[PDB]
């Protein structure tokens, strides 16, 4: 019925906006998202919803945790948006389907409401110390380990102000000598080859209480780094 939002443009995913959202942004790849849904086969013989749960239905965008359609559809939504998505079998379950639930070559339709989306917490303890927003997915799945040699492009911001900008080759576990905050080294260890990302650092994972005098960074400071991972050697 509505706008074709399939990347290939084959009318595979159709979207009608039932209620307009708020704000300019949409979730990007790797972001965790929070929705409520109601879904049905085009014929309307089986029904499903997330509404029965106290908590929102949630997953990570782009990682293939849901039907291709959702990975596509949600990356077009805004906060508070309510929409209707029609999903041709190509972008859902295709030839075989998923017996017993979903019959062969079924088109699916969803009502989806996006409540919340947030970057990935990279900290082992999930304390919100390191948050990543992916700009460009990298090709690879391998990641650096402690002692690896990396080629990075990095740009540090304090209160939206650039203080550090370099293209360097260094060793994981030796960033301190090159004035790189600990959280950054830990963020790199989570990136893939060719990944462009924005990384948010709370003071604890930044320069902490000491600050960094030469970068005009006060003690106890939130840092935004925008960094690119070119290539690397594991050791």
Curated annotation (Swiss-Prot):
Chain positions found as Phosphotyrosine: 200
Keyword tags: Acetylation, Cell projection, Chaperone, Cytoplasm, Cytoskeleton, Isomerase, Isopeptide bond, Methylation, Microtubule, Mitochondrion, Nucleus, Phosphoprotein, Repeat, Rotamase, TPR repeat, Ubl conjugation
EC number annotated for this UniProt entry: 5.2.1.8
Chief place of localization: cytoplasm
Phosphothreonine modifications at: 123
Listed transmembrane segments: none
Cysteine-cysteine disulfides: none
Gene Ontology cellular component list: axonal growth cone; cytoplasm; cytosol; extracellular exosome; microtubule; mitochondrion; neuronal cell body; nucleoplasm
Catalytic activity reported: [protein]-peptidylproline (omega=180) = [protein]-peptidylproline (omega=0)
EC class (word): isomerase
Domain PPIase FKBP-type: 30-118, 147-233
Entry function: Immunophilin protein with PPIase and co-chaperone activities. Component of steroid receptors heterocomplexes through interaction with heat-shock protein 90 (HSP90). May play a role in the intracellular trafficking of heterooligomeric forms of steroid hormone receptors between cytoplasm and nuclear compartments. The isomerase activity controls neuronal growth cones via regulation of TRPC1 channel opening. Also acts as a regulator of microtubule dynamics by inhibiting MAPT/TAU ability to promote microtubule assembly. May have a protective role against oxidative stress in mitochondria.
Free-text comment about domains: The PPIase activity is mainly due to the first PPIase FKBP-type domain (1-138 AA).
Protein name (record): Peptidyl-prolyl cis-trans isomerase FKBP4
The organism of origin for this protein: Homo sapiens
Full-sequence range covered: 21 to 255 of 459
């Amino acid at each position: 019925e509505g706008v074709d939002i399939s990347p290939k443009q084959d009318e595979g995913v159709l979207k009608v906006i039932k209620r307009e959202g708020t704000g300019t942004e949409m979730p990007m790849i790797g972001d965790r998202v929070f929705v409520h849904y109601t879904g049905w086969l085009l014929d309307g013989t089986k029904f499903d919803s997330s509404l029965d749960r106290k908590d929102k239905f949630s997953f990570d965008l782009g990682k293939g945790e849901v039907i291709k359609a959702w990975d596509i559809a949600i990356a077009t939504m805004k906060v508070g948006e309510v929409c209707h998505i029609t999903c041709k079998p190509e972008y859902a379950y295709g030839s075989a389907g998923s017996p017993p639930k979903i019959p062969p070559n079924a088109t699916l339709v969803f009502e989806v409401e996006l409540f919340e989306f947030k970057g990935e917490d990279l900290t082992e303890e999930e304390d919100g110390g390191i948050i990543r927003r992916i700009q460009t997915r990298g090709e690879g799945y391998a990641k650096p380990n402690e002692g690896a040699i990396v080629e990075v492009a990095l740009e540090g911001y304090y209160k939206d102000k650039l203080f550090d900008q370099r293209e360097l080759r260094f060793e994981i576990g030796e960033g301190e000598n090159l004035d790189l905050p600990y959280g950054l080294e830990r963020a790199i260890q989570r990136m893939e080859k060719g990944e462009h990302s924005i990384v948010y650092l709370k003071p604890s994972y930044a320069f902490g209480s000491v600050g960094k005098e030469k970068f005009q960074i006060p003690p106890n400071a939130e840092l935004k780094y925008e960094l690119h991972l070119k290539s690397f050697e594991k050791a």
